[PDB]
Amino acid sequence: QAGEITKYVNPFIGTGAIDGGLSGNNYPGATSPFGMIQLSPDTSEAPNWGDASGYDYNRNTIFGFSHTRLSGTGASDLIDITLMPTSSGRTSSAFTHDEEKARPGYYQVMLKDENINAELTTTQRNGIHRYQYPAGKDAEIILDMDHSADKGSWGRRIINSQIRILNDHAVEGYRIITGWAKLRKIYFYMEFSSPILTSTLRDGGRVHENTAVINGTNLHGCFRFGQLNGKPLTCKVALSSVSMENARQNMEQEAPHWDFDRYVAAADADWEKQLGKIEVKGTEVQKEIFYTALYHTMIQPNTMSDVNGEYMAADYTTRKVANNETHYTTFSLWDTFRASHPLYTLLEPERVTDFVKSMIRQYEYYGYLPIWQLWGQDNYCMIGNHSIPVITDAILKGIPGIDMEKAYEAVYNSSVTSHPNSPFEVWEKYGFMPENIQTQSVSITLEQAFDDWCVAQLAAKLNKDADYQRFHKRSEYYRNLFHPKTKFFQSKNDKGEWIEPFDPYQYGGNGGHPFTEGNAWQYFWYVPHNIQALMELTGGTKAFEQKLDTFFTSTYKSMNHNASGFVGQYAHGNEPSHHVAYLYNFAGQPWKTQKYVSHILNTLYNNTSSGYAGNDDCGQMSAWYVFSAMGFYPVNPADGRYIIGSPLLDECTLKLAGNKEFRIRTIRKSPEDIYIQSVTLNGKKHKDFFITHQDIMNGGTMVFKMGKKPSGWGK
Amino acid sequence: QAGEITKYVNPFIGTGAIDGGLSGNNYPGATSPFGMIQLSPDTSEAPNWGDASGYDYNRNTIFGFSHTRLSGTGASDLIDITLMPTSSGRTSSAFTHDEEKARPGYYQVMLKDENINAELTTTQRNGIHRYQYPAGKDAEIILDMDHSADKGSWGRRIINSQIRILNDHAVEGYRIITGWAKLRKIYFYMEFSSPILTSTLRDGGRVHENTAVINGTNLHGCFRFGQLNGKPLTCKVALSSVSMENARQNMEQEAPHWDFDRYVAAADADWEKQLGKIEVKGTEVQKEIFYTALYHTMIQPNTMSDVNGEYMAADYTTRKVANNETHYTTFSLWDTFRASHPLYTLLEPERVTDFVKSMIRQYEYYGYLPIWQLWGQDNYCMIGNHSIPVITDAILKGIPGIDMEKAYEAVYNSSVTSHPNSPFEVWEKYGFMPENIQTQSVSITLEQAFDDWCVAQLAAKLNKDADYQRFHKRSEYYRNLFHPKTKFFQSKNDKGEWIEPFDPYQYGGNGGHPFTEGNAWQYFWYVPHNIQALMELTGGTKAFEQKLDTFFTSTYKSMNHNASGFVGQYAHGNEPSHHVAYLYNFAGQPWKTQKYVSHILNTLYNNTSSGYAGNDDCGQMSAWYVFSAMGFYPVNPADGRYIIGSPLLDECTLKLAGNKEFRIRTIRKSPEDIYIQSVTLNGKKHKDFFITHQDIMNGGTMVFKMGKKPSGWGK
Ligand SMILES: [Ca+2]
Ligand SMILES: [Ca+2]
């Protein structure tokens, strides 16, 4: 049954916002799993934070089809190498959603101004286009090398670029550009299925007719093919971070032929194998939401090395991975360490080895592990050193092919070598970040303490007992900001005094406040490695339960743009809250976890363009759905335990390595049955409120008996 | 006799200006012939156009010793990797010229604030330092990665950089920076002869004590070695355009040992072999001026490829030359095609093969040959496509190892593929550049017509007869701007009308005027490939002679900063005039050439800091002296003829390939004997006013009979 699973993915979920609500910043264009190429229309001349992927569902004009982007980020970048079909040298066109389709590996739209049909597909490193022009009209392609994310942010400018016509069917070039990533070099090689008859190249006002090459900072091409009289024009475009030669080789290996439908079909088969890793059973809407979410987790991290292994490293030099390896980038770690990376350990252990290796390369050539990585380099966005949980998690779980001593070097040195937002001599001297020395101090203290717990766990695994003590002590530094009267984590200055005045509802931004894109209410819960300690500090399990109740019911509104989708003070759009609904289990009240998780799944996710309660954040919003719908969530994303919530779907099957399955099953009378009555794992009654990574990866079956009313299970 | 020739070089010639006069923009620090490293003190925090090499003789403060620069340019760039010795973390110091020495491959200065002695030398790709601290004082080195040319020009900013301490004796890093060259990557590897005891790294206000690495845009290091108590600190620094690994390898191969005096001695031996290629006899002052000029021609073009052959190409990718090859850059072509490159065909034919190959690489990866090349890429400074005369000249003269068909491809395509300041479809449609379509139109028309003559000559050599006609016709386009009433070359618009009003004294700049850094009086003479045509147009030899007389005696003053050193309207500081004193030969009055050449040599060159009548322009001012002092000059620098002037020196011997000499000899009673009475070449009386390249390269002897009064020779 071809398209059995892929037919459920709706790439328009998360591409817009309804009224003035919240968008995922997802894109509907074609891509391949963990690919280099995201071939998609831009509905803006210059993508910005409100439409960072390049597309907005509320818009009606397409300004070209570019080949790279981020999914669900709060800042725009990439947007490289932009083609537009036309008959009269035009650069934009109207379109309607009524004449537009999208599915895994495929996008189509009718461009209405000149009645030209556009279809897109991809391979791992190539974009394939097919354009159908009216019979009797001239066929032309415009290449725009200036089109990019907004040039008024990040000091973004094109340093240099080239367009070069090699023969009548081939064009190469490149651009070097600054932005959110400090410096990116994007090389291309392009071919046409019909010969170029005439052409024009320009750089701003400087125009050159039928000229084989141009160099500059504001380049544009127009290639004219004449009357095609019903033959569609097929275009192929390969990219590289290193060279035009590599891009050409990427095309020779992955995309040598000219059969468009064959490319489309392979892309669909590829997505069917990927999405097939979790087979689910539920309503038609739930399958659409679930498979679309699973898709969003699998469109990055992005392939960066070429088919010959070469890539631009973090010291801006050209290097090569081994034959069986792939260098990846796009690591939105402040979001993705929480759920996306745990999800990859279940579904993509072979890729996780390459992700870890890619992170370690930043250490090897830049001096510390990635904080937030984009086009092979760090941009320091957000806080923490959250490569560390990801590398730790992979090693403790036994993901194969990782050099452990080298990984520990990287992790250790990243934790003792001070760098922006990590003053480690301040850290160990005070036992916290003082707000007057390091801003975002309370968020950093909580998140960094968690990173240190991870280092400790890795030290213990390698019998490095002195290191263990050092990092274990550091992991307990959250205590130094716990205020004993108010029972919030609050900021202190270097004299050890509590900053006055303090309001736990007050949102901070990305500096000038002790919290990062949230308030003290939301950050209170961030001790994922020692919830028992946190419970004790709050005044015991009963006290901790009541504080959670206040958190989930208190509707006061002070503000920050990123935090949205509210259940009291709980904002599902920002990921400090994401683990919190699972904390009622720890308090002795699992039914409350089941209640709130079910509320969020049913109420804050949907199958319209709005889709999500905030930016998808490289699929972290989606990974939350994937996990929670299956019925468990990695509260501590480095301890290899998944905390039970409430399974949404009737059944899920995880297709694992190799010949193995983890089968999740439900006994229910209706969808109102959201409370767990009991759980069985491999025939034995299951008394804990978690399952382990080993429980899943061994293969087996887990059965949930559900009911309409709270049971008493784990109570 | 060690230092027989090197003792004559005075690196302070051209480093200053006296009253408000004119400087060469030369530098006194250490370098090697055609090297990668120019290790020299900067007397400014941020070098600008008034001190573009980094040093000014009128200054009394040193702000560090950097490792790269240009010699004699009108804009600053490079200035990379800056060390400063100190005992108390200081960044600047007073010095006096009384306690400062310099000679080929060596610089020394006493830094007076803390009484520290600095000595510098180089290899091809390494800089070697030796610092002597007072006994009883702490030894420290500051590394400054922000120090550069003025950041308010060219949009210059550091994109990213690194300092990284590898062990107690080794530091690596890099910087990526924009400027006059669009994008440069400079990687380094450094070692110390004593172990680092403590250290600090910072990025702006962010300071990290005893921390092994830092990344950012404004980086500074301080390394502390303790009390050395009389042991000098030796530092070694290698560079690369590609990687830290390559830089380290450059040090392993060229500079593995720790004997400073041995490095100094090899640098001096290397310079003695180079300067020894012309052995001269004259007064002590003339030998100082001559050998210093010869030195200035040999400090660039600069080595860019590492010892493994790797280099950054003009498409910003990493490539590799063959084993026996070297990739070079720093091609100040608008100046250097005139005399410097002709000089290299006599003295450096083996290097010229590599220069030509390096130029062709820009064509291969960027689409046309270099106009003005800097750190492996074009910056378009000035006008013309003046790689073309250089490549043409080398091929016609039979410089070996140049692929001629590939070279012709590069030359041809660079002459028909339009690009900035070369609208070739405008060129062939109008038979000139119309000022209202292309500015600097008269200068471009004259200089481009000369480039086209060169292409024609190359076409004829390869029996490409259609091409010959095309480019020969183009070479005659100077005629289309010759005004028949006024007898100047003047600007026209696209309707073919002469622009009114027109003043032949009025200087233009680099746009908005039809002349480039000069007036119509100075550009009038630029038809070096058809002086007979120019003579006819002026009204015959008598008329042409009289126009030259007016040019050399008319003292009116309107203005431009670059044009200076005046003999009437003749300005020796700018190179459009440079061939003009030799034109009296063509008019039938060689004594007048001999008079004016002798005046310029004796009056506009000197052995003080001012030194030259304008910027040295990568040794073009110096190459003029070298040629003219020997007694001939390449008026047409692609026809292989050297036009006779007046020999200044008693004797010169050119030491050629191999076992061959060209011996130039004079019969004279005193230095007042400046007029040529007769000339002998290989025993036969020499009736022409030129000698050929073959006459010189075959070896032989040329004798000038001189006298106090004009003779009648060639009259
Ligand atoms: Ca978010
Ligand atoms: Ca000049």
CA–CA separation, A46 and A29 (whole Å): 17
B315 interface with A at CB cutoff 8 Å: yes
Q: For strand B700-707 and strand B651-656, is the pairing parallel, antiparallel, or unpaired?
A: unpaired
Q: Where are the beta strands (DSSP E) in B597-668?
A: 632-633, 641-644, 651-656, 660-667
Q: Letter for the amino acid at B504?
A: P
Please tell me chain A's helix, strand, coil percentages from 3-state DSSP, rounded to the nearest 5.
30, 25, 45
CA–CA separation, A542 and A532 (whole Å): 12
Task: Please enumerate in sequence order all residues whose Cβ is within 8 A of that of B219, keeping only pairs 6 or more positions apart, or say none.
Answer: B145, B146, B161, B162, B163, B173, B175, B201, B202, B203
Strand partners, A237: A127, A190
CA–CA separation, B254 and B263 (whole Å): 10
Nearest to B206 among A176, A183, A420 (CB): A420
CA–CA separation, A412 and A410 (whole Å): 6
What does the block give as tokens for B23? Answer: 């400087």
Q: Could you tell me if A607 and A324 are in contact, meaning their C-beta atoms sit under 8 angstroms apart?
A: no
The answer to whether the peptide bond before residue A127 is cis (omega within 30 degrees of 0) is no
Please give the DSSP secondary-structure letter assigned to residue B689.
S
Q: Could you tell me if A620 and A577 are in contact, meaning their C-beta atoms sit under 8 angstroms apart?
A: no
CA–CA separation, A425 and A423 (whole Å): 6
Task: Please enumerate in sequence order all residues whose Cβ is within 8 A of that of B132, keeping only pairs 6 or more positions apart, or say none.
Answer: B116, B117, B119, B232
- The coordinates were experimentally obtained by X-ray
A183 contacts in chain B (CB < 8 Å)? 159-160, 176
Distance between start and end Cα atoms, chain B: 45
Secondary structure (DSSP) of A589-658: -HHHHHHHHHHHHHHS--SSSS-SSS--TTTHHHHHHHHHHHTEE-SSTTTTEEEE----SSEEEEEETT
Q: What is the dihedral of CA A476, A481, A482, A485, to 10 degrees?
A: 150
Secondary structure (DSSP) of B141-207: EEEESS--S-TTSTT--EEEEEEEEEETTEEEEEEEE-SSSS-EEEEEEEEESS---EEEEEETTEE
User: What kind and span of H or E run contains A226?
Assistant: strand A219-227
Buried b (16+ CB within 10 A) or exposed e, B17-39: beeeebbbbbbbbbbbbbbbbbb
- The alpha carbon of A412 and the centre of ligand 1 are apart by a number of angstroms equal to 28
**The tokens 């020894």 sit on which residue?**
B276
Q: Could you tell me if B68 and B81 are in contact, meaning their C-beta atoms sit under 8 angstroms apart?
A: yes
A414 contacts in chain B (CB < 8 Å)? none
Q: With helix as H, strand as E and coil as C, how does A283-312 read?
A: CHHHHHHHHHHHHHHHCCCEECCCCCCEEE
CA–CA separation, A633 and A584 (whole Å): 13
User: What kind and span of H or E run contains A177?
Assistant: strand A170-177
What does the block give as tokens for B374? Answer: 């800097």
**The tokens 């091929």 sit on which residue?**
B395
CA–CA separation, A38 and A198 (whole Å): 29
What does the block give as tokens for B678? Answer: 């007769």
Task: Please enumerate in sequence order all residues whose Cβ is within 8 A of that of B632, keeping only pairs 6 or more positions apart, or say none.
Answer: B642, B643, B644, B645, B690, B691
A211 contacts in chain B (CB < 8 Å)? 417-418
What does the block give as tokens for A491? Answer: 């900021």
CA–CA separation, B592 and B584 (whole Å): 6
Q: Letter for the amino acid at A564?
A: S
Strand partners, B207: B202
**The tokens 């003339």 sit on which residue?**
B286
B208 contacts in chain A (CB < 8 Å)? 418-419
Residue B187 distance to chain A (closest CA, Å):
10
Burial of A629 (0-12, 13-18, 19+ CB in 10 A): buried
Name the closest residue on chain A to residue B176, using Cα atoms.
A316
Q: Which of residues 224-253 of A touch B (CB under 8 A)?
A: 242-244
Residue B469 CA, distance from chain mean position: 34
Local structure of B603: helix, strand or coil: helix
Give the C-alpha distances (Å, rounded to integers) separating B172 from A249, A368, A369, A579, B351.
34, 15, 19, 43, 31
Buried b (16+ CB within 10 A) or exposed e, B371-386: bbbbbbbbbebbbbbb
Provide φ and ψ at A82, rounded to 5°: -120, 115
Give the C-alpha distances (Å, rounded to integers) separating A40 from A121, A257, A376.
9, 22, 22
Cα angle B456, B457, B460 (rounded to 5 degrees) comes to: 85
Task: Please enumerate in sequence order all residues whose Cβ is within 8 A of that of B269, keeping only pairs 6 or more positions apart, or say none.
Answer: B2
Q: Letter for the amino acid at A465?
A: D
Buried b (16+ CB within 10 A) or exposed e, B286-319: bbbbbbbbbbbbbbbbbbbbbbbbbbbbbbbbbb
Nearest to A367 among B157, B215, B315 (CB): B215
Buried b (16+ CB within 10 A) or exposed e, A199-212: bbbbbeeeebeebb
Which among B189, B60, B65 has a CA at the least distance from the CA of B119? B65
Which among B685, B684, B675 has a CA at the least distance from the CA of B708? B675
Distance between start and end Cα atoms, chain A: 45
Q: For strand A675-681 and strand B373-374, is the pairing parallel, antiparallel, or unpaired?
A: unpaired
Secondary structure (DSSP) of A541-563: HHHHHHHHHHHHH-------SS-
CB contact under 8 A, B244 and A315: yes
The answer to whether the peptide bond before residue A309 is cis (omega within 30 degrees of 0) is no
Q: With helix as H, strand as E and coil as C, how does A486-498 read?
A: CCCECCECCCCCE
C-beta neighbour count of B557 within 10 angstroms: 7
Please give the DSSP secondary-structure letter assigned to residue B508.
B
Local structure of A214: helix, strand or coil: strand
CA–CA separation, A15 and A107 (whole Å): 14
What does the block give as tokens for A606? Answer: 């949907």
Cα angle B172, B173, B175 (rounded to 5 degrees) comes to: 160
CA–CA separation, A203 and A144 (whole Å): 10
What does the block give as tokens for A513? Answer: 């406040």
CA–CA separation, B386 and B389 (whole Å): 6
CB contact under 8 A, B182 and A162: no
Local structure of B505: helix, strand or coil: coil
Q: Could you tell me if B342 and B370 are in contact, meaning their C-beta atoms sit under 8 angstroms apart?
A: no
Strand partners, B41: B65
CA–CA separation, B297 and B348 (whole Å): 11
Residue B368 distance to chain A (closest CA, Å):
9
B566 interface with A at CB cutoff 8 Å: no
Residue B4 CA, distance from chain mean position: 25
Which among A334, A328, A291, A294 has a CA at the least distance from the CA of A74? A334
CA–CA separation, A616 and A600 (whole Å): 15
A437 interface with B at CB cutoff 8 Å: no
Secondary structure (DSSP) of A4-55: TTGGG--TTTTS--STT--------SEE-TT-S-EEEE-SSSS--GGGTTS-
Provide φ and ψ at A233, rounded to 5°: -90, 120
Local structure of A235: helix, strand or coil: strand
Q: Which CATH code for domain A6-276?
A: 2.70.98.10
Q: For strand B138-144 and strand B82-86, is the pairing parallel, antiparallel, or unpaired?
A: antiparallel
Q: Could you tell me if B129 and B83 are in contact, meaning their C-beta atoms sit under 8 angstroms apart?
A: yes
What does the block give as tokens for B562? Answer: 């670059």
User: What kind and span of H or E run contains A65?
Assistant: strand A65-66
CA–CA separation, A581 and A552 (whole Å): 9
C-beta neighbour count of A3 within 10 angstroms: 14
CA–CA separation, A271 and A102 (whole Å): 13
Cα angle B214, B220, B222 (rounded to 5 degrees) comes to: 100
**The tokens 């190459």 sit on which residue?**
B623
Q: Could you tell me if A15 and A59 are in contact, meaning their C-beta atoms sit under 8 angstroms apart?
A: no
Which residues have beta carbons under 5 A from ligand 2 (an ion)? B 574, 614-615, 617
Q: Where are the alpha helices (DSSP H) in B517-634?
A: 520-523, 531-538, 541-553, 590-603, 620-630
Q: Could you tell me if B714 and B690 are in contact, meaning their C-beta atoms sit under 8 angstroms apart?
A: no
